[PDB]
Symmetry: C6
Subunit: 173 residues, 6 copies
């Protein structure tokens, strides 16, 4: 079943790209403008938002998508260069894709977890002692996080299946 796997992998990749490109930017548009803290201290909002969300989910996902697409670009550009052999570059491409996908999945888990809480406790200067801040659209962002994790897991499973189909001996040699 080395063909159905490829079909599903291509479809899933296109699905992820389309979903992100269409809705992600809109979801995270008012992330800072609607972030509010219970305080009168100027600059507390900026510091607390920066501490709560060091990197927005959307930018992480864009970086992941481009990086995961990169090895296919390498293979295609090499194929173009060859004309005006290739059977070897394919295995390395698959291995690198596997490694990148697994790394990005683990990175997402360790960076963001599985949920976006509605409240945040912030004790960064210039905020006095500890203050409470309130997040915008926590539930939608939690749903997006879980959905992206699931799609990435499906991609990892399909890539591993293809790699196992290729075989240990071919990879090692």
């Amino acid at each position: 079943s080395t063909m159905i796997g490829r079909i599903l992998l291509t479809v899933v990749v296109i699905f992820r790209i389309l979903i992100v490109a269409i809705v992600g930017e809109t979801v995270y548009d008012d992330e800072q403008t609607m972030f509010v803290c219970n305080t009168l201290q100027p600059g507390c909002n900026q510091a607390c938002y920066d501490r709560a969300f060091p990197i927005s989910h959307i930018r992480y996902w864009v970086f992941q998508i481009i990086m995961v697409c990169t090895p296919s670009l390498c293979f295609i550009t090499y194929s173009v260069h060859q004309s005006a052999g290739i059977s070897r570059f394919y295995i390395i491409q698959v291995v690198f894709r596997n490694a990148l996908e697994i790394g990005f999945l683990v990175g997402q888990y360790f960076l963001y977890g599985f949920s976006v809480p509605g409240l945040y406790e912030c004790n960064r200067y210039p905020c006095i002692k500890e203050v409470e801040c309130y997040v915008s659209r926590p539930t939608e962002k939690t749903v997006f996080l879980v959905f992206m994790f699931a799609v990435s897991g499906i991609c990892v499973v399909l890539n591993l299946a293809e790699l196992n189909h290729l075989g240990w001996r071919k990879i090692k040699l």
Copy 2:
């Protein structure tokens, strides 16, 4: 009368895609900025809006449209792969499209109902006791909800008609 069924199904799909892509984003642009609650508590607006609208209608509809289009993408990519058999894949594609359409229709009904009320009663922290909040353009959103439900129902009916035309004994084998 299966050919006219395909013609109408294609036209309805294109119509739904065009309507959503052109107006949906504009309709729901100020959903949170014009959402206001009668209170002085910081962060009550954010929590109450998140509780009232866990997932925006537009994002659900975009997800539904892409997911419903997915099986056709699978079939097309399989056909491309085969050249440089197909009669069987068509029935499975039709069945999966039917299932996805029915599931998304039921999900819309159970998530959103048939109307968007103008008032919302909210009792989520940090709001004190129970507060009243006011929604932005509820009537237009209700019209959009009903229209999308009707279009999805028409799509479901056409898909069922085509599947019945195929007959039970081809699906079984």
Copy 3:
């Protein structure tokens, strides 16, 4: 003189599409942000705006344009399907176009009238008793309404002329 009728109908259809697509969205951008009521009651602005403009003109016109274009899409897709009889489908397409255009013209008349007043009287909860609200750029919207009505009327006249040229007997059979 059926040929000049077709030429003019195509030209006016393109003209309406271009005008709407280029200006309509910008005309109605600040419809709600610039809508203000003389009151201190939270939520009165939202309710009064929703009551005054249940559906924006621009969205009604977009729906009308797509719906009126739909029969041509049906005919074109049927023609594509036939290649890899047609004379009968043309008359049905013309009749359906006539009906849709007339229906949308009547609907516009009964929904919006011929003018957008600068003042609105609103007595919807939570507004206390009856309040006065002020509309954004009413004159431009009135001009747009009248222009769209005139263009739709011209389209109706041309469609009726073409249908009359076809003849009653052909329509019956």
Copy 4:
């Protein structure tokens, strides 16, 4: 001189289209948000802005550009219809273009004049007695007005030159 005339006319038309499409929308973006009146009366700003600028310059110019391009569209569509005589249609097209250009130039002069003043005196309800309002970017709008008038005048002159070259007797039809 008939050839260089057409060359210049085409170049000038393209120039006008490009200038408007690129800068006009940006110039008139904050026309209402930056329009302020010296008053405390709710709704005075909206009424006075509507009175001062019943139709924005940009929308008038877009309408003029599309309407002036329409006769060429009619001629092109007629030519397409003929293939799968034309000498006659060209003269009528030129005459109609002349008439439309002259009409739009006169309309601009009578609607807007040659300058946008920085102050406006407004006595429309709900404003009490008479109030002073202040316009946004009056000088840039005046420059745009004069430039568009000059370009339209050049177009009118070129069209009249072409019409004269055609001759009275040929157009006597």
Copy 5:
């Protein structure tokens, strides 16, 4: 070495177009929104901004780019018309391009100078007596001004070099 002159001129023109189109609009987006005057007079901000920046740099540069591109469009349209002689039109096009570029460079210098100050002294009605206003991103705008002046100077030098590489006696005839 005329050929490398053509390469350099073309690449410089493309570079200017790309830089302006990509960054200029974003640089001058908040020119008026972030313009502040130390006063309580309503309407003083509008008048002071209008007197300080009668025409935005970006619009002047767009006008310059389109105008300097125009003669090439004239030449290309003439060439297209010729098929379904040319060696002569080219020198006139070169001369006109050179004159236009020099004129726009001189106009830039005489209209904006070489710097954008952070402070402005405004003395225009309705501002009481003399007021002080503060500009948005003066340093970035100064850098943009100097860069555009340098690019235009390079274009002027290359145009003169091309004109000389042709020679005086062909220009005379």
Copy 6:
């Protein structure tokens, strides 16, 4: 191993362009609107922001990308001109690309350093004495700065490898 060098260089260039074009503008959208200083002095925010960020990172990076791409455009246009020799131009193109890349990397290091602090101390007129200002999303901008520096360093290394592969005696002649 010069071919893999070219493959990697092309892929890295495309990667940088895509990342910047997709996320950079959104990262720096609210750089000035969310910049706040602890003061009551009008115009202090503008002056302090202008002093802290004379040129935005995004515009510097756009300029760098276009400038680094320029030599390839020169080579391509020269090749186009030659048809309706080239071996020499390639070496000069490579040398100029190397010089531009190194210069832009050094310029970035000397202009911005390796971090964006969350606090800024500002003593520019009209601010009284010395005030404290707070930056918007400093952490994301720090990450972007470091990532761009790393990508530019990789490009420099690949360019140096290719230039060394060409060797000194070819460059000298």
